[PDB]
Symmetry: none
Subunit: 253 residues, 4 copies
């Protein structure tokens, strides 16, 4: 059904598309950036969602190709409209350890930034919780090198998987994205709200910015805003959308 | 060299001994409890340290036997002196998911507590970071059952492995033990101290107690005490010691 | 449900029993030996068949303990009646690569043979098809050592898994056991019968003996006998049975 | 060094070349066919041999692309000279389970055969021993479909990996290729020769043809010929060579 060969074939047939989800300033509601997500549109049978292919992409290693293509395609999509983007427009790309450590990764990040404007945009590498970067000198060298080139980092889905305090200690990242399981449970249960407060306090000393993921309702947003979260993202504002529709809805109007 | 069969044989030959490390009130320096640790004394060749056998104990499943024996032996060691123990004396036992989910686990915990005094002692199950308890109804039922019997829980080596905010959200534990990597780096680096502050703030709302592990120097202790940590443990006070020596040094004088 | 810890606990609780299946001379119908098989009798819920635990026993490594116990228990079962066993009575034990390479394996085989009579019995190590012995000098040394001690080898379930011509080339074994899938399909399909002929021709040059497994009907037996198979085993004669019943039915009458 | 991304890049840069090894009638020495093998010529550093990339091609799934390209390129190479090929000229292509089960496989095989002459050539899918086709109705349907289109099958490297009697039982193939480890050891050791005899007897009933692989010396050939092997292949006649050289040496003279 879903195999490494089917993923390879799908990459060659360009069936993996960059869908783009806007991200907003929590204070003002204004567009500040986006996240690039992947959708597999199988020509006959339809969507195969990330949950069914990403893991196998990761274990097979094909994720490296997929992420490279996605980065390239995102540059193509946003280049025509880059002069219309707000200043300091954030572009979130999901990065696993495999991609981060692969030969040629830094180069691919530079190509994206140079095409779009070294100083107009901010590339945010959203480090995944499943396949954490190893805590080694060589990993830290790649991390520092990218930082020197004004590329930034997020701990994605923070509070789940391997997204622990240790990653913040080993790597001075720039953003923390709060997993949706805390955003959506804050004020259903007894600790989730407290956990968000904790992530807010965590960020404050080193001066990191926080994004709440999975914001689905207005009460969730108000709650996140009240607690000092900096950016918001979720279905309340918009799900991820095809690039042309991202441009048409959120950039060019 | 180290195999599952060698571990089995070593269990039958009683080569795995409960060594006991005292734990202290951070405010006053007073003895409040202990942790039970395992040492493998191979008759010819000497110590085989936990790092070389625990993982294989865990993957083989033999850990369940080992932990059961350790619990039993700890009861035997402390029973003669239980009337000399301070009130609310804490006994820390390291528990993996495998042990926690095994048939007969709750019974073994009760046997320990009943032998030593339902109300004199407090059993603390120190949940490991490597092999986390699954987040399921059945796991939560076992957890709640043990709580109803006045047994308590710690997230051990918090901030490392799978010891994440999620575990605190899924399981209302009673203690957090701060991994030594934060205790010992707090005031060498730029975030470790901040991380300890964060763990202190985390605990405060639900009213959990914190123990700093790996306290090795007086400056580390002072630092942990100053930051509001409740209990201290480490080589500064004492390494783990054989039971008879634990009793002789810390209980019976 | 079935875990490594449950297998460990079951080993300690002696829930894994040696059941014994007789093996017969194809020419005469006479008892020539047996195979020792394992049955897990779970005290409440009943049988857990080999298909559900062996693989996990193998990957966890616990198989080494289980096989050792089975060998020991087989000696205990047959010792009281060893003087009643036919001469050259074969005892088949199922052995994986893990058991074969584990420290202490040769010793366990000798203990079995010495207890039962160096020259009355023939121990047959039935090498499994799933977890083949590696083709290395060290493996061959263990193999040769055991041969020098008059212990013999079978390629079990030959024609399936990794039970290939290569194993016969690397290890001069003494027996081939034909997988039941060929025995039972010989004269349903177009090649299975031909495959059995092939295994018979294979054995003839080096002078190996063949046992047909899974003999279920008289026509299957007649067919195997006609094709020059030396030994027969299967439900037609008897399924595996508890030891006491093996002794009572096949040895002591 | 060797990664899935490097393999992808190498495919796009056409660094994987079809080298072709002739195959001959054992009786007469006459050219009867060929096998298509892959060589990775890295532009700076030189050859990367199959042992270092095939496994990763297979696990990544990229093998499907590579095999497709190889099939296409083989058609291009032989088309100009197809009228010069002997009748019933065999073309051996190495096929793993992944390729065999991938969408579009049957079509690629037809394209090769139609380009070269439905009745001049015989396509032989050489099924690998490492990644066996699963024994399922759906696999058998694909197998039967290809057979109806006059495409044929070989069990490659028979006697090693998963190349067992079972594959012959599940799939009525047309050829068996004897692994070189038996060809080259026949008359060094005590069983290898016997194994070849066995493969010859195996083939005879269903009427399969045998090819001896890795024929390196004249004595190996004479031995294989004497034992009733139908086709020969190996360095004694020719190693694999670039296509142009295959055509120039073995077809066009």
């Amino acid at each position: 059904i879903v195999t490494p060969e089917a993923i390879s074939l799908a990459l060659e047939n360009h069936e993996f598309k960059p869908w783009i989800q806007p991200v907003f300033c929590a204070q003002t509601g204004v567009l500040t950036g986006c996240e690039v997500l992947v959708r597999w549109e199988h020509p006959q049978t339809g969507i195969i969602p990330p949950d069914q292919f990403i893991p196998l992409a990761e274990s097979s290693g094909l994720i490296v190709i997929m992420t490279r293509q996605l980065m390239k395609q995102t540059a193509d999509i946003l280049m025509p409209v880059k002069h219309l983007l707000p200043d300091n427009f954030h572009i979130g790309i999901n990065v696993s350890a495999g991609c981060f450590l692969a030969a040629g990764f830094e180069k691919e990040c530079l190509n994206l930034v140079n095409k779009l404007g070294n100083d107009k945009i901010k590339l945010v590498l959203e480090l995944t919780e499943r396949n954490p970067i190893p805590v080694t000198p060589e990993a830290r060298a790649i991390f520092d090198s990218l930082h020197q080139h004004n590329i930034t980092f997020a701990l994605d889905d923070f509070g789940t998987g391997y997204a622990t305090y240790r990653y913040l200690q080993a790597f001075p990242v720039d953003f923390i994205k709060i997993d949706k399981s805390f955003v959506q449970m804050a004020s259903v249960d007894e600790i989730s709200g407290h956990i968000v407060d904790n992530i807010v306090e965590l960020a404050r000393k080193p001066g990191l910015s926080i994004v709440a993921e999975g914001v689905e309702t207005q009460e969730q947003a108000d709650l996140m805003i009240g607690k000092g979260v900096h950016f918001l993202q979720g279905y309340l504002y918009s799900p991820p959308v095809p690039g042309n529709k991202f441009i048409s809805e959120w950039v060019m109007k």
